[PDB]
Design a protein around this ligand. Structure first.
Ligand SMILES: CCCCCCCCCCCCCCCCCC(=O)OC[C@H](COP(=O)(O)OCCN)OC(=O)CCCCCCCCCCCCCCCCC
Ligand SMILES: CCCCCCCCCCCCCCCCCC(=O)OC[C@H](COP(=O)(O)O)OC(=O)CCCCCCCCCCCCCCCCC
Ligand SMILES: CCCCCCCCCCCCCCCCCC(=O)OC[C@H](COP(=O)(O)O)OC(=O)CCCCCCCCCCCCCCCCC
Ligand SMILES: CCCCCCCCCCCCCCCCCC(=O)OC[C@H](COP(=O)(O)O)OC(=O)CCCCCCCCCCCCCCCCC
Ligand SMILES: CCCCCCCCCCCCCCCCCC(=O)OC[C@H](COP(=O)(O)O)OC(=O)CCCCCCCCCCCCCCCCC
Ligand code: HEM
Ligand code: HEM
Ligand code: HEM
Ligand code: HEM
Ligand code: HEM
Ligand SMILES: COc1c(O)c(C)c(C/C=C(\C)CC/C=C(\C)CC/C=C(\C)CC/C=C(\C)CC/C=C(\C)CCC=C(C)C)c(O)c1OC
Ligand SMILES: COc1c(O)c(C)c(C/C=C(\C)CC/C=C(\C)CC/C=C(\C)CC/C=C(\C)CC/C=C(\C)CCC=C(C)C)c(O)c1OC
Ligand SMILES: CCCCCCCCCCCO[C@@H]1O[C@H](CO)[C@@H](O[C@H]2O[C@H](CO)[C@@H](O)[C@H](O)[C@H]2O)[C@H](O)[C@H]1O
Ligand SMILES: O=C1C(O)=C([C@H]2CC[C@H](c3ccc(Cl)cc3)CC2)C(=O)c2ccccc21
Ligand SMILES: O=C1C(O)=C([C@H]2CC[C@H](c3ccc(Cl)cc3)CC2)C(=O)c2ccccc21
Lengths: 126, 248, 93, 62, 385, 57, 385
């Protein structure tokens, strides 16, 4: 449960600093390759663990045909994974695809929550 | 750890029984008992072995009945309430040389000779280490090693100082069958006999072991096959995606 | 049966997942296939791929660990040898 | 594509030599496992029961 | 509805073994709990059957086991199976606990599931230890002295606890007799506990070697996994057969065919293998109270794992930096074990010390660090700005 | 395993629980036959039976 | 929802002990299963604590219990509680089984509920018998001879079974040792079984001293019955305290402070009281095979009770002709017991025989008859034509 709102903070910063960005992103790119996951038709937002309220605010909200999309991949994943194989090289999700389709809502919802947390314990000075 | 405190590693002699398919050499066991009887019985108990247990392994029914009765076990009191002896039965356990822990030590400079019944398992290396400590009493305690009064040197014991003096000296046993009653042949036997003593089940144990594996292996391979069959629909199962017109 | 606490699993027809549309599956009877579906031949080109894809992640750490093992091992045999008793009297007290 | 359009199992399916070898091989498989299992299950039981017959050190027919 | 669903008894049977919806994608790692339940059953059957000829009196104790060996019909098979089996129990259980780390099973909603297994693991060590103290060889009488003595580490009352717990001056007769009785009791406690463990498992169902949601492609445990589990089963028995008939003591310490003697500790104190890595950790600490604490802490620390894992995904599967240290952890743990076998000699002590550090640091330090980094690699490794 | 040689006995059904147990019963004697033979042979000369042979008293 | 409802563990706790909807009208008879679970717990605690000082070797056996008596701290309290408790277990269990006859609990949908209790009752006799054979006094060694010998009654194989079961020529040492081990095992089987028993109970809920539907006026077990059950509990302990401290053997046979002797049966063979009515039934039959069968049948016959009850209402409560014979049944059963204590003298044998008849006739004959009549009294005793 390291927060997405928190990964935003850190990863935005690094993306902005042309200093940092040039150092980090090569590796990060190298990383999201060695993961293996785009070879099981998986976009990264598929991987995010869901058994928690925020993601269930964030999937109830996710556009229909978008969820049908997720779905097919997630089943394609399992299916292949169980065949103990990797997909036909040209079925792999391509580097431009791995887009944070979910991340707004996760962020949208995280935001909303932290707000309510605050507004439940908002104190008073007289 | 200094190689002196450890003791020298006994080597991998090639015993009759080493291997997954190897019964003991019962002829060998038969010899060890004599090598046992005449030599080491003088000091060493073999209490968890019973006369009957010999029958069918090293001897024949009377052969063991004979040995058995050469000793007077205690026996239930007469009508008056006074003790009595009696010879042994096959139902008995081969009696120790000493009447208690003390006289065992009295007779050995205060050493307590280990009961041997379990020796080939109560030691690392075991068969080898037994052979080697018995054929490894070298002539003199190596340059510099200063040995206490009533203690010998052995590289195979830890820190060499063994309270048991050498005991195998060629031919001291008259090998009844008529084999070279050497020391490396007097020894190799009492080892094979002492092996038995700590692991009597032995030949059956590999017998049954054989069956267990052959059946169990086959089940393993058989099970595998079966599995791919019941999975065959899921393994070769194949999906397809067709996005659907936006209206719901 | 009292109320049950909500989870992230249900049973068939209410398994818990999102509302599937679009996928279409196909399969074939386990009777209706070659006994030995795909064995040897090209099914083994993977027994070296399922190997390659990972071995480093085990070997590298196994390596680090097995050489570190061998080292102080050697080092111990030394300081407990003749040639070593010197260093011992120093390292050890 | 159309949904009727049927994917390829020509690799997996057997040639029409016999639509009955993929059954016969399986049953001798399942069956010889069945056999041996039982045969083992039998012995396993036999073993623990006979654990209770008179210990080797009693039968004092005296 | 069908009967197996309708019946009060068969409905459980069905819903945990026949009709259970498993992720379609889970592999042979998951066959471990199955094979775990199988050992517990092998432990309990062979144990009872042996107890029928066992005597827990400090005299007859060592001998009676020899009795089971020399005399009882198939009795040697009873012993070598009990003993070798306890080991395989422990291997399989480590592999089961491994699997849980690697794929990050310990991770919500499965915390309680996880936590309970930590209780089971504790009870299995407690159990197997007592069963060892019941042979009453050398390793037994001195094993039983030290574990009883861990309690002295307790401020003030500690010695008395030990005295109590001993029922007298030393690990004596009222000791082996209670150690036998408690050895009977406890395995039913494990089984009791295996049930809550399986209940937790049940309300969330198993995870997958992909750490995504199962709820889109479930299949029923019968007949796939029932048959899948049967493959690991036979294989399990095979290696166990191998040891039991051919290598019955390639896993035990020869010091234990020596009748226990309260005046004379041996000079080769190697404890059980599955125990070694803890012996190591214990020794690594030149302080008594702290050393004890750190040994116990070596197991408890396992409970922080769902908090310190900072990640956003369950599973080392798509996790290179995670995989890597995960196998440093495994391999450390084995080394730690090698350290347990060797004498408190140099550099071994200092090697021991370093592994121990690596050990706790892996839960407490490496993991939350790495996983936080790994979150950030996952962000910048794609998005625009 | 050949489709002819199997289907002869069992046509197109598996083995039947009782036939299994029957085979089991038979197998169990046929096996303990073979294996106990091959083993007594493999260890020829070594068995107390072979040693009872030569040795006289 | 509330946590106790939501939790995987506390939800059971709640739904079987806190939030359970009971009929509003049930009386102190129903406090028996509660008090039943309490004995089983008293049996298991005190047993284990005693086993820690028990030796099951035929020599040390009789003495070791004296050891528990003379030496172990509070050990006498351990014994008198184990033993007197076993009795109260059996009383309470009869009263529990009584209640089930009288109010016709055995009656659908509660058949399985009922049936399982017949299994429990069987296992409790099996259990307590073995626990007796473990004292190894006189009554013990001869008790253990006869029960082992019931198996000879089995055609052909019967003697061998007995030989096996003995582990030798007589009830010897491999016998008391297995009888100890099986005494450990079984109580967990009762507890296992008490769980299915409580599961059956659960899906239908308790009946009422009115044999009508509960579903119109339920109240929750907490806090009424939890507190109600607490009244019978303390009362239970009180009488048990009374025996345990003041009348510790007002329930046992003095022949049992005599060390068992395999050559010499006593000449006062009174067996345990809760067992007597069966001893009676057994003796009543001058044939060996038949006699055995009829003894076992004395318990099995209890399984027909839901078929032979022909009635249209559950409960003797509104049932005069039913009440009446129901207490002939109770009172027969007690007499049968008195017969067990007396010698096979006259007219006792013939009295024994008649009671035995009355016994089975009550299930098999009186009940379906009476109940069918009683249906018809209920019709013509109102309607016009
Ligand atoms: C012990 C169980 C013995 C018994 O007599 O149970 C009978 C039970 C009756 O079937 P049932 O589903 O209860 O019928 C509807 C009534 N409520 O039938 C059963 O419950 C059979 C269940 C077999 C238990 C196997 C569990 C392992
Ligand atoms: C753990 C104990 C394992 C030892 C026993 C191993 C049993 C192997 C034999 C099982 C044969 C299964 C079978 O014949 O299927 C009938 C039956 C159904 O077959 P179907 O009607 O062909 O689907 O399968 C079972 O449910 C058997 C369960 C097997 C136990 C695992
Ligand atoms: C209870 C019945 C459960 C069925 C369990 C599966 C039985 C088949 C196992 C294979 C055994 C075999 O092939 O027999 C050779 C062999 C038969 O010997 P024989 O019948 O004495 O000639 O099996 C045995 O000696 C019995 C012990 C087998 C132990 C192998 C290790 C597996 C442990 C798991 C079993 C523990 C059960 C509790
Ligand atoms: C309580 C004490 C601390 C925990 C104790 C753990 C004790 C050491 C565990 C003993 C070693 C057990 C094997 C550990 C490896 C787990 C296997 C695994 O995760 O496979 C995934 C791993 C990769 O999974 P994939 O990426 O999904 O294929 O498989 C391997 O890389 C090969 C494992 C070879 C070992
Ligand atoms: C397995 C062997 C066969 C069964 C064993 C039964 C053994 C004998 C049972 C021992 C005696 C237990 C008391 C039996 C009376 C049941 C009490 C009862 O039903 O009360 C209702 C009965 C009337 O209930 P009401 O009509 O609803 O008030 O209460 C009485 O009449 C007084 C009972 C005094 C005893
Ligand atoms: C086949 C002949 C014999 C064998 C195989 C044998 C074997 C052994 C073994 C295995 C030990 C154990 C030491 C260890 O491994 O830690 C031992 C010790 C001893 N033996 Fe023997 N023995 C034999 C004959 C004798 C004889 C003839 C005597 C004296 C008459 C004797 C007196 C002793 C004594 C006093 C010890 C105690 C040594 C110690 O405590 O280190 N043994 N023997
Ligand atoms: C008596 C010992 C044990 C038994 C009988 C047992 C049983 C099982 C079974 C049957 C499963 C389902 C199959 C599988 O997922 O492997 C499982 C999974 C699991 N076990 Fe255990 N286990 C035991 C020990 C442990 C221990 C010692 C732990 C932790 C310290 C643990 C934690 C878990 C977790 C978290 C899962 C879920 C795995 C997943 O998501 O796939 N278990 N266990
Ligand atoms: C979780 C289950 C169990 C574990 C892990 C376990 C562990 C052990 C171990 C390690 C030993 C020493 C084995 C040896 O080296 O000889 C032992 C011995 C023994 N156990 Fe168990 N045990 C378990 C269950 C049981 C049960 C249910 C019984 C029922 C009576 C039992 C009875 C005995 C007896 C009589 C011995 C002494 C004979 C022997 O050592 O083989 N055990 N146990
Ligand atoms: C270990 C022994 C037993 C335990 C722990 C036990 C437990 C219970 C409990 C807690 C109840 C609920 C309270 C009550 O209704 O009394 C109950 C009721 C019942 N028991 Fe048992 N019982 C035992 C023995 C038996 C036996 C031996 C039988 C039959 C042979 C039996 C059959 C029934 C039936 C049919 C009910 C339902 C009673 C009703 O409708 O009120 N039980 N039992
Ligand atoms: C349903 C549960 C139980 C019943 C009905 C039962 C019954 C009995 C009986 C009737 C006796 C003889 C008592 C005497 O006259 O001295 C006995 C003895 C004994 N029982 Fe149990 N028992 C049960 C559970 C247990 C348990 C769980 C243990 C655990 C070790 C145990 C251990 C012993 C021991 C060591 C004795 C001999 C000492 C003595 O007789 O008091 N029992 N049992
Ligand atoms: C969610 O995913 C799952 C899953 O849920 C399950 C269940 C399995 C299958 C796993 C299991 C079925 C494991 C279950 C484990 C147990 C049931 C262990 C419980 C064992 C006990 C409680 C032991 C109790 C034993 C006894 C009472 C036997 C003792 C009786 C004796 C000794 C009688 C002998 C005495 C005499 C005198 C003859 C999976 O493979 C799986 O993966 C996909
Ligand atoms: C439908 O109507 C009901 C109803 O359902 C219930 C539940 C009750 C209440 C009844 C109960 C709660 C009965 C429940 C009975 C049980 C729970 C019995 C189960 C007992 C066991 C399973 C025993 C198991 C015991 C142990 C494991 C303890 C052993 C531990 C030991 C010995 C540790 C000590 C050892 C050492 C070394 C310290 C009613 O009164 C009632 O009537 C209105
Ligand atoms: C725990 C101890 C276990 C001991 C060993 C167990 C041995 C199990 C043997 C059981 C054999 O059970 C056997 O299973 C086969 C399926 O393979 C059944 O076959 C049944 O389904 C098959 C399809 O699979 C059909 O061809 C057939 O018409 C039908 O009868 C058959 O009715 C039964 O006879
Ligand atoms: O000195 C010890 C010793 O310290 C242990 C150790 C092994 C690990 C034990 C342990 C206890 C509890 C847990 Cl949760 C983990 C390990 C503690 C005792 C032994 O097992 C041992 C065996 C035989 C002789 C001496 C000894
Ligand atoms: O002869 C017997 C005898 O027959 C029983 C009887 C008592 C009831 C037993 C019984 C066994 C099983 C059931 Cl299901 C019911 C009762 C059978 C043995 C004894 O309990 C007994 C005790 C002491 C000495 C002799 C004897």
């Amino acid at each position: 449960p390291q927060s997405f709102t928190s990964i935003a903070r850190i990863g935005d910063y690094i993306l902005k600093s042309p200093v940092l960005s040039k150092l980090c992103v090569p590796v990060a790119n190298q990383f999201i390759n060695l993961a293996g996951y785009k070879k099981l038709g998986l976009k990264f937002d598929d991987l995010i663990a869901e058994e928690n309220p925020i993601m269930q605010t964030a999937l109830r909200r996710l556009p229909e045909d978008e969820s049908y999309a997720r779905a097919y991949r997630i089943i394609r994943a399992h299916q292949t994974e169980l065949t103990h194989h990797l997909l036909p090289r040209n079925e792999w999700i391509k580097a431009q695809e791995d887009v944070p389709y979910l991340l707004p809502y996760i962020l949208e919802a995280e935001a909303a929550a932290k707000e309510k947390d605050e507004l439940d314990n908002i104190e008073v000075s007289k | 750890m200094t190689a002196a405190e450890h003791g020298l590693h006994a080597p991998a002699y090639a015993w009759s029984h080493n291997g997954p398919f190897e019964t003991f050499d019962h002829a060998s066991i038969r010899r060890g008992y004599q090598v046992y009887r005449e030599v080491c019985a003088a000091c060493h108990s073999l209490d968890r072995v019973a006369w009957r247990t010999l029958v069918g392994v090293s001897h024949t029914n009377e052969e063991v009945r004979n040995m058995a009765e050469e000793f007077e076990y205690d026996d239930e009191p007469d009508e008056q309430g006074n003790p009595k002896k009696r010879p042994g039965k096959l139902s008995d356990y081969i009696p120790g040389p000493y009447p208690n822990e003390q006289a065992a030590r009295a007779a050995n400079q205060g050493a307590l000779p280990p009961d041997l019944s379990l020796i080939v398992k109560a030691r690392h290396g075991g068969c080898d280490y037994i052979f080697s400590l018995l054929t490894g009493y070298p002539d003199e305690p190596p340059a510099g090693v200063a040995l206490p009064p009533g203690s010998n040197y052995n590289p195979y014991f830890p820190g060499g100082s063994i309270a048991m003096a050498r005991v195998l000296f060629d031919d001291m046993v008259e090998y009844e069958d008529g084999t070279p009653a050497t020391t490396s042949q007097m020894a190799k036997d009492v080892t094979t006999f002492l092996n038995w003593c700590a692991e009597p089940e032995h030949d059956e144990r590999k017998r049954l072991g054989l069956k267990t594996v052959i059946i169990l292996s086959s089940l393993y391979l058989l099970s595998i096959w079966v599995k791919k069959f019941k999975w065959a629909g899921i393994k070769t199962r194949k999906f397809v995606f067709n996005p659907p017109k936006p209206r719901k | 049966g009292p109320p049950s606490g909500k989870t992230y699993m249900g049973w068939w027809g209410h398994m818990g997942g999102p509302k599937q549309k679009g996928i279409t599956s196909y399969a074939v009877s386990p009777y209706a296939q070659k006994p030995l579906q795909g064995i040897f031949h090209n099914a083994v080109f993977n027994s070296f791929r399922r190997f390659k894809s990972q071995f480093l992640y085990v070997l590298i750490p196994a390596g680090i660990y097995w050489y570190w093992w061998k080292n102080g091992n050697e080092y111990n045999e030394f300081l407990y040898s003749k040639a070593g008793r010197e260093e011992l009297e120093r390292v050890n007290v | 594509k159309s949904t009727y359009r049927t994917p390829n199992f020509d690799d997996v399916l057997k040639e029409n030599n016999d639509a009955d070898k993929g059954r016969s091989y399986a049953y001798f498989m399942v069956g010889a496992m069945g056999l041996l299992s039982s045969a083992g299950a039998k012995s396993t039981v036999e073993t623990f029961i006979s654990s209770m017959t008179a210990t080797a050190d009693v039968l004092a027919m005296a | 509805m069908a009967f197996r669903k309708s019946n009060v008894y068969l409905s459980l049977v069905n819903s945990y073994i026949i009709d259970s919806p498993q992720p379609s994608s889970i592999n042979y790692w998951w066959n471990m709990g199955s094979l775990l339940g199988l050992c517990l059953v092998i432990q309990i059957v062979t144990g009872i059957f042996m107890a029928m000829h066992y005597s827990s009196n400090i005299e007859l104790a060592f001998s009676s086991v020899e009795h089971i060996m020399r005399d009882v019909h198939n009795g040697y098979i009873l012993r070598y199976l009990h003993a070798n089996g306890a080991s395989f129990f422990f291997m399989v259980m480590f592999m089961h606990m491994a699997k849980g780390l690697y794929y990050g099973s310990y991770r919500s909603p499965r915390v309680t599931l996880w936590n309970v297994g930590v209780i089971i693991f504790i009870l299995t060590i407690a159990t197997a230890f007592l069963g060892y103290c019941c042979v009453y060889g050398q390793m037994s009488h001195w094993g039983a002295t030290v574990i009883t003595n861990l309690f002295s580490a307790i401020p003030f009352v500690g010695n008395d606890i030990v005295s109590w717990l001993w029922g007298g001056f030393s690990v004596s007769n009222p000791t082996i007799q209670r150690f036998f009785a408690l050895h009977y009791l406890v395995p039913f406690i494990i089984a009791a506990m295996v049930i809550m463990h399986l209940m937790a498992l049940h309300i969330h169902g198993s995870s997958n070697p992909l750490g995504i949601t199962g709820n889109l492609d479930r299949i029923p445990m019968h007949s796939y996994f029932i048959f899948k589990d049967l493959v690991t089963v036979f294989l399990f028995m095979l290696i166990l057969a191998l040891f039991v008939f051919y290598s019955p003591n390639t896993l035990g310490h020869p010091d234990n065919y020596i009748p226990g003697n309260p005046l004379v500790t041996p000079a080769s104190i190697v404890p059980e293998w599955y125990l070694l890595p803890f012996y190591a950790i214990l020794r690594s600490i030149p302080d008594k109270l702290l050393g004890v604490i750190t040994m116990f802490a070596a197991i408890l620390v396992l409970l922080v794992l769902p908090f310190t894992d900072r990640s956003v995904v369950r599973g080392n599967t798509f996790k290179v930096l995670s995989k890597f240290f995960f196998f440093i952890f495994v391999f450390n743990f084995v080394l730690l074990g090698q350290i347990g076998a060797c004498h408190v000699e140099v550099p071994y002590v200092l090697m021991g010390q370093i592994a121990t550090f690596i050990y706790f640091a892996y839960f407490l330090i490496i993991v939350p660090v790495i996983s936080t980094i790994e979150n950030v690699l996952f962000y910048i490794g794609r998005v625009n700005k | 395993s050949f489709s002819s040689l199997y289907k002869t006995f069992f046509k197109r059904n598996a083995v039947f629980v009782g036939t299994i147990f029957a085979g089991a019963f038979v197998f169990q004697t046929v096996f303990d036959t073979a294996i106990t033979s091959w083993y007594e042979n493999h260890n020829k000369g070594k068995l107390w039976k072979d040693v009872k042979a030569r040795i006289a008293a």
